[PDB]
Amino acid sequence: MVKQIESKTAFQEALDAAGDKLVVVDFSATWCGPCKMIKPFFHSLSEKYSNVIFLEVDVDDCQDVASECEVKCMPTFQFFKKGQKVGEFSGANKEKLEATINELV
Numbered sequence: 765m766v767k768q769i770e771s772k773t774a775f776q777e778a779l780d781a782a783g784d785k786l787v788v789v790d791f792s793a794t795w796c797g798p799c800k801m802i803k804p805f806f807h808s809l810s811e812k813y814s815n816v817i818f819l820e821v822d823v824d825d826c827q828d829v830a831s832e833c834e835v836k837c838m839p840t841f842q843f844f845k846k847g848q849k850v851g852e853f854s855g856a857n858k859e860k861l862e863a864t865i866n867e868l869v
Contacts, residue, residue, distance in 0.1 A: 765810045766790075769821045775829045778819060779847045786869045787817045787844040788861075791830055794822070796838040798856035805858050809865070816869055843868050 769775050769789075779787055790806050792799035810818035823830040823838070833842060837854030841861055844850060851864055 766807050766818045766820050769819050769829070770825055772826065772828050772832070775819075775821065775826070778817070779844055782817050782844070784846060785815065785817055786865070787819060788865065789819045789821055789833075789842045789844070791821050791823055791833070791835045791838070791840040791842065793824060793838045799839045802839065802856040802858065802861075806861070809862065813865065813869070816865065 767778075769778060788809075790799075790802075792803070806818065806820070809816075821829055823835060833849070835842075839856055840852060840854050841864070842849055842852045843864065845868070851868055853860060853864065
C-alpha cells in the first residue's frame with residue numbers, strides 16, 4: 765500500500781513503472797518525530813487514492829536517492845509525473861500534502 769524503496773534502482777524502476785500516474789514520495793528518517801507522526805496519514809492517503817502511487821524512502825537506507833533528489837529537510841514530500849519532479853515541500857503538514865496531491869493528480 766505504501767511501498768518501501770530500498771535502492772536507487774528500485775526508485776528509478778518505480779518511477780518508470782508508474783507510467784502517467786502521480787507518484788508521491790515520503791523521504792523520512794528515524795530521528796524525525798514528525799516523520800513518524802505523519803506515517804499513518806501517509807498510509808491513509810495510499811488507501812484513499814488508489815489512482816496515485818505512494819513510496820517511502822528512508823534517507824539512511826538510500827542516501828544516494830536522497831542526495832540525487834536534493835532532499836534537505838525531514839520529512840520531504842516529492843511529487844513525480846513521467847519520471848520528472850513536479851513538486852516538493854518539507855514538513856509534516858497533512859493538509860498541504862493533500863492539497864498538493866489535489867493539485868497534481
